[PDB]
RNA sequence: GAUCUUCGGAUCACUUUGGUCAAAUUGAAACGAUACAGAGAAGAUUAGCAUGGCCCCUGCACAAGGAUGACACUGCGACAUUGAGAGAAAAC
């Protein structure tokens, strides 16, 4: 992950996108230090929000705007700059707007069911349209 | 929303919330100190190992320690009364 000045220089397209990745890390540090105003699980939601945003930024760079070479993209996935499994989910139908991977796994629920944000809202009552407890997601359904 | 399909639709995904319990006087324990006595075996000083269980404490412990850890160590009536006398009463 962390890179030293004596390390192998990253591929050619890295320096154009270095500052925004540094800024992502800056907000991650801010979220780490910021404390309070939530339950034991609620305070840990912005972490997943920012992680999804960064991985989505890299995925957008490669697969929709083609602004980076495949070598640099593979390097970024190797250096944990982006979540490989999350992108793998984004690449298949039905999961285009997946929030995180804890809201898809059924072994982490009480009754072996995916999270509430995964249900399309057309099949969901108005009262139970809430923010996900895992990450604060407000609807992952591709339809929505 | 993506994919086809022929503009009828079909696919792809589908119900979260570990809860000694709501932001700490009034539902997570156990006591400081001062004041009283104030250290087992029939004189006196004192080794200990036990017995009993709604007494525990330290310990990983079925070792061992905590004053021999402490408290306790007693005591009574499935006695039948007649053996007799005396004054009374009721009775040989
Ligand atoms: K002694
Ligand atoms: Mg002893
Ligand atoms: Mg004893
Ligand atoms: Zn999620
Ligand atoms: Zn969720
Ligand atoms: Zn979600």
Curated annotation (Swiss-Prot):
Pfam family, one: BUD31
Gene Ontology CC terms: post-mRNA release spliceosomal complex; Prp19 complex; spliceosomal complex; U2-type spliceosomal complex
Chief location of this protein within or outside the cell: nucleus
Family classification: Belongs to the BUD31 (G10) family.
Classification via PANTHER family: PROTEIN BUD31 HOMOLOG, PROTEIN BUD31-RELATED
Quaternary structure (record): Belongs to the 40S cdc5-associated complex (or cwf complex), a spliceosome sub-complex reminiscent of a late-stage spliceosome composed of the U2, U5 and U6 snRNAs and at least brr2, cdc5, cwf2/prp3, cwf3/syf1, cwf4/syf3, cwf5/ecm2, spp42/cwf6, cwf7/spf27, cwf8, cwf9, cwf10, cwf11, cwf12, prp45/cwf13, cwf14, cwf15, cwf16, cwf17, cwf18, cwf19, cwf20, cwf21, cwf22, cwf23, cwf24, cwf25, cwf26, cyp7/cwf27, cwf28, cwf29/ist3, lea1, msl1, prp5/cwf1, prp10, prp12/sap130, prp17, prp22, sap61, sap62, sap114, sap145, slu7, smb1, smd1, smd3, smf1, smg1 and syf2.
Name of this protein: Pre-mRNA-splicing factor cwf14
Gene: cwf14
